[PDB]
A paper describes a structure:
Acetohydroxyacid synthase (AHAS), also known as acetolactate synthase, is the first enzyme of the branched chain amino acid (BCAA) biosynthesis pathway, and is the target for more than 50 of these commercial herbicides. Since the introduction of these herbicides, 197 site-of-action resistance isolates have been identified. These sites are mainly focused on just eight amino acids 1 with all located in the substrate access channel or the catalytic pocket of AHAS. Here, we show that these mutations can have two effects (i) to reduce binding affinity of the herbicides and (ii) to abolish time-dependent accumulative inhibition, critical to the exceptional effectiveness of this class of herbicide.
Next, the crystal structure of the P197T mutant in complex with BS was determined. The P197T-BS complex is very similar to the structure of the WT AtAHAS-BS complex, with the polypeptides and the herbicides having near-identical conformations. In contrast to CE, BS interacts with T197. Remarkably, the efficiency of accumulative inhibition by BS increases in the P197 mutant by approximatively two-fold. Altogether, these data suggest that the inhibition potency of BS is not affected by the P197 mutation. However, for BS accumulative inhibition was maintained for each mutant, and for the two P197 mutants the affinity of BS (Ki) remained high.
Numbering used by the authors:
A (entry chain A), B (entry chain A): 86 to 667
């Protein structure tokens, strides 16, 4: 039973109704940067005893923190910004949350209703701007609509295929007094009628039928399974089907497991892509057949009967056409199939040991590998050490590029929501703010941002946030002085012709530039650099053991390449397994 | 006569046609951050001998630098970004260029034409996103359209009311070979037919008629006069009409002049707003009657006959209704009126010395003023010293907030395009990147970014750009540890209740946090802090005299308030002339 801070017959500002609407949704933390058009909302926030604000240093930091909070917890992330430049600074995070299906509620102040459309001070038509990069959005045109719109926004952000919802609030509405009605019905008839039903036995029985008729089945699991860890693990017990995972799926099934093929796709393992190439049954659970995974679609799982279970009917049959499909929550489908697989266990007698052995041979002939050169630190190796000293139990966020691939390849995620990474939009500068949100949501966890030097500098101002919020964020900075992934493509496809990929100072080209230790020092954050592989284990242990935030600058030879690699639009037969920038 | 690097019968990549299209427009400098979907464009850029790239550390830095380049030079600023997160990171700069009418051409890489609409890797529907915040934009659907679209984009960005134009280029189009045709006609029939004619004598003669019948005329000049410095100065010679200027107009008429009323509006001088309040003729040249200037519209220039000259007919009669108008280039109108005023000089005998004296009394009773407390540095005073040691000849860029108002109030701009400031959107984080673009366009000028500690940290990563580009950018950081302007409004309208406006570390609240000197040190930029007013003159001289970039952290009491202040929607009779946070 909720207790308002206001008498139920007492008028209060729209801003106060908006904050109480958040309290009534269970919101505990928001990421809010104030300005003129949201001041009223900030004033109302100080009157709340149950909502904490984490002040970022840039609204892009605020929205990426909100995403970290959501991805690391399964709760919606809440960001708040002023009008105009506040709102436009959210845009990369909105697009990012929409592409990765992350639940987010973004609230923007706006000029007054009578000023809308007049090229007013700090006016942006943010509802127009963000229509194509949000799941839904709203312009509040009457203070009495605030309760319903906030309720609809959380409902839409968190139900179905999750995503971002933006709510735009004119300053005059924030100031208007009213008595809220907390019992209005949501006004979403179409969306609620198009919500998937629980899966039917008919369809689940057909999937189990297909499994029992198959000799080479592969599971293809993605971000849709992040709430299905238990059900999926049980399903693999009852079937012994080996598991390939997308970049968004990492940790749905444990990486340190004998049935795990690890990641498939452009930079997937040779054995994961082999499994899919030669499978005769493809169980695609919570995946969207993106071409970073599939390569050339006609060549992808070309001898497989394809089962697709997705909560979004628009995904089913979009790129690849399944033989069987379920439109619904993969968690319910797994539960239902598990009962069938348990009851008919002795009748079914499922054994894929011959397929599993065929894959385990590929696993032994073509494992993930890296070279050690003299005493230079291999980035791959630094991530393996971090895995060992954290016992695969850290929350890992990353930037985008080679280090992101290595954080996926060389750390064994044990649970979903340990891995926080921008996959569909691939936004640099995500890792540090995302780690801020993850640490706020999981204040007892080990939180490590595995970052690149180009990604890290983009939202470096959030080091200040980490300090004043006294968050124990660890930064494993893999520093190769380049835009590594663009550099790799220059090496393989442009004859190593460099086009603006070097991030250091060309006037002193053998100096580490910038000196990231001084960024940390500027914000009172302990830091160290490590250059020799022999010093790595101790350096990483110091970072872990030192209380509070810590930056470790890990210097890496820049000629490393992420392998394997299927070029864009290619087939398994195109996989590249050797080479680097030397 | 232009010399291609390609034979005129030789096919080359669309990327190479795009770069040569820029060369043919006279482009010398671009601000380009590479990614996968723009790599081809970056490769083609390295093949150009005439185009230099300035690599920013964040695309928001790139676009704000492009704006600095444009505002400081009168040329279009050119920024280039990859697809997806590259493109979304431009958005605040696009909206900013559209609100301040800054010419800008933004080029974004895009996924291939067949991938558009498939939720592809790093795909953003950027043409949809930016339609309402650009003057125009384009999606290139055929390599043969590149010459025409680039020509149209520069034409639209620079003609008429200038603004940003975005061009979105699919990666397959960048790779396609073709032979460009450099002689296609622009396809802009409607826009070119709606282009204003040279002003008619009928309308110019009526304006001079009104002047000669007036006893209290005021000039109200804005960003539209930035190319009319000579004509406007001559016009003031022939008429002796005193000049009030908007924040975007600063320097069109010299600040250090006896006829200058300085800035009008919410934070205008008492005498400028008085002049307008009591005028009987308002000459509104290159201004858009924004309500940061007008306050309550009915009360604004309520006894004046209003003349409005604007290049955009949509502005004429929008907010205030003129008695006379010219739709056209204010530079041509001034030239035309100057001939009339010269020929009929002895017949007209214009003398407003009685009005000018009435204003000069207001100038003496209510000048701009500040308090000095002990040995604390007044920010107002620090800007006056900078004015003196630079002889009012520096290019000044700023962030947004109190320091922005003080940079407008206490520096005497002598020419247009010395002042680079975000006025309509008011985007924090603009000052440092804008100074980068200004220094690249004016490599011999004194370039000073007068910044606040909240604005400065937002794009602090561009310190790296300044270093490797070896740009002599000076940073006068006015550091009050707060979001000053939001703090001021908290003081006057919310009983000093602080809602997330303190930027320092509350655990050690009397320490300067962060330590901006270490940000500069991280990027190899000389820096110093100054805290005592007696040390200010020397500290600023050191910054000016030390070659190359330099950061000066100027510590300021946070209780300062920008005065005067007409509250939003108010009238002259509401002006606030005293008070602060003490
Ligand atoms: C540099 C770089 C390289 C990359 N290379 C690779 C790569 O080699 N391999 C790779 O896998 N990725 C790679 N990507 C990531 C990539 O672009 C996509 O982000 C990823 O492939 C898509 O993940 P997904 O298929 O799991 O779909 P998601 O984006 O995770 O979407 C989840 C899907 O499940 C559905 N869903 C959600 N909830 C449920 C539910 N309860 N029940 C049923 N369905 C549900 C949604 O409707 C959607 O279809 C790379 C990214 C970058 C930046
Ligand atoms: C914190 C803050 C406080 C502010 N307070 C103030 C304030 O007290 N005073 C103030 O003035 N501003 C203030 N502003 C700035 C403000 O919001 C607007 O940016 C400014 O008032 C508008 O400038 P402008 O009228 O010159 O129009 P601009 O934005 O400069 O537009 C120029 C106008 O001229 C036209 N034009 C362009 N070229 C030509 C040409 N060749 N011939 C004819 N017409 C042309 C365009 O069509 C347009 O109508 C403040 C901003 C901030 C961030
Ligand atoms: C905190 O410092 C400042 C400064 C400033 O102008 C310099 N504005 C704002 O808030 C706004 C932000 C955006 C639009 C605004 O316009 C506005 N808002 C109103 O809300 C009631 C009324 C109004 O009357 C014109 N104008 C306003 C505004 O508060 O005027 N805050
Ligand atoms: C499927 O076939 C194609 C063809 C093509 O251009 C011919 N583009 C794309 O998608 C992209 C979309 C966006 C960026 C792209 O470049 C890119 N993609 C990467 O995927 C991980 C990495 C990378 O590193 C530089 N560049 C690519 C890219 O496939 O080149 N796919
Ligand atoms: C906001 C933004 N701008 C540009 C991007 C385009 N990309 C990339 C890619 C893969 O999307 O190909 O396009 S990755 C990348 C370079 C990575 O820099 P690093 O972290 O310091 O080095 P690391 O050694 O790769 O770990 C760029 C420039 C991007 N995604 N986001
Ligand atoms: C991207 C962005 N986010 C928030 C903004 C809303 N505003 C402002 C305003 C005037 O637009 O009122 O809204 S000014 C301001 C605080 C200024 O920080 P400072 O430079 O360190 O301190 P100074 O002492 O004022 O010089 C904020 C938070 C903004 N405009 N841009
Ligand atoms: Mg605002
Ligand atoms: Mg069947
Ligand atoms: Mg080793
Ligand atoms: Mg790097
Ligand atoms: Mg790209
Ligand atoms: Mg008349
Ligand atoms: Mg003094
Ligand atoms: Mg930044
Ligand atoms: Mg400040």
């Amino acid at each position: 039973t909720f207790i308002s801070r206001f008498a139920p017959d007492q008028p209060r500002k729209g801003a106060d109704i908006l904050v109480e609407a958040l309290e009534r949704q269970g919101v505990e933390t928001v990421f809010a940067y104030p300005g003129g058009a949201s001041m009223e909302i900030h004033q109302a926030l100080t009157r709340s005893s149950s909502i904490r604000n984490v002040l970022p240093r840039h609204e892009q930091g605020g929205v990426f923190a909100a995403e970290g909070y959501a991805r690391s917890s399964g709760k919606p992330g809440i960001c708040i910004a002023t009008s105009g430049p506040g709102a436009t600074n959210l845009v990369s995070g909105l697009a990012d949350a929409l592409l990765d299906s992350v639940p987010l509620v973004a609230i923007t102040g706006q000029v007054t209703r009578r000023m809308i459309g007049t090229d007013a001070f700090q006016e942006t038509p943010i509802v127009e701007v963000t229509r194509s990069i949000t799941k839904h959005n709203y312009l509040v045109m009457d203070v009495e609509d605030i309760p319903r719109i906030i309720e609809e926004a959380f409902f839409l952000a968190t139900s179905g295929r999750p995503g971002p919802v933006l709510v735009d609030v004119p300053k005059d509405i924030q100031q208007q007094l009213a008595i809220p009605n907390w019992e209005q019905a949501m006004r979403l008839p179409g969306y609620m009628s198009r919500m998937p039903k629980p899966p039917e036995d008919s369809h689940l029985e057909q999937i189990v039928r297909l499994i029992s008729e198959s000799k080479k089945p592969v599971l293809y699991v993605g971000g849709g399974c992040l709430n299905s860890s238990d059900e999926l693990g049980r399903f693999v017990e009852l079937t012994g089907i080996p598991v390939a995972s997308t970049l968004m799926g990492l940790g749905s099934y444990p990486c340190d497991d004998e049935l795990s093929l690890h990641m498939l796709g452009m930079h997937g393992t040779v054995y994961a892509n082999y499994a899919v190439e030669h499978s005769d049954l493809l169980l695609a659970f919570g995946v969207r057949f993106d071409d970073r995974v599939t390569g050339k679609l006609e060549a992808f799982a070309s001898r497989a009967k394809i089962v697709h279970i997705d909560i979004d009917s628009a995904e089913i049959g979009k790129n690849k056409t399944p033989h069987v499909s379920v439109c619904g929550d993969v968690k319910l489908a797994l539960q239902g199939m598990n009962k069938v697989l348990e009851n008919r266990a002795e009748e079914l007698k499922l054994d894929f040991g011959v397929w599993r052995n065929e894959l385990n041979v590929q696993k032994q002939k073509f494992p993930l590998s890296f070279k050690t050169f003299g005493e230079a630190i291999p980035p791959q190796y630094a991530i393996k050490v971090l895995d060992e000293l954290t016992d695969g139990k850290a929350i890992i966020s990353t930037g985008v590029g080679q280090h992101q691939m290595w954080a996926a390849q060389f750390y064994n995620y044990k649970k979903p929501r340990q891995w926080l990474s921008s996959g569909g939009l691939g936004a640099m500068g995500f890792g540090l703010p995302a780690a801020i949100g993850a640490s706020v949501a999981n204040p007892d966890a080990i939180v490590v941002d595995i970052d690149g030097d180009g990604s890290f500098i983009m939202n470096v101002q959030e080091l200040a946030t980490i300090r004043v919020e006294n968050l124990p964020v660890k930064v494993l900075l893999l520093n190769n002085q380049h835009l590594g992934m663009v550099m790799q493509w220059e090496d393989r496809f442009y004859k190593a012709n460099r086009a603006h990929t070097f991030l250091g100072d060309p006037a002193q080209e053998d100096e580490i530039f910038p000196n990231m230790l001084l960024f940390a020092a500027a914000c009172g954050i302990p830091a160290a650099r490590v250059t020799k592989k022999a010093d790595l284990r101790e350096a990483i242990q110091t970072m872990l053991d030192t209380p509070g935030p810590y930056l470790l600058d890990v210097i890496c030879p820049h000629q490393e390449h992420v392998l394997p690699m299927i070029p864009s639009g290619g087939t398994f037969n195109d996989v590249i397994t050797e080479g680097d920038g030397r």
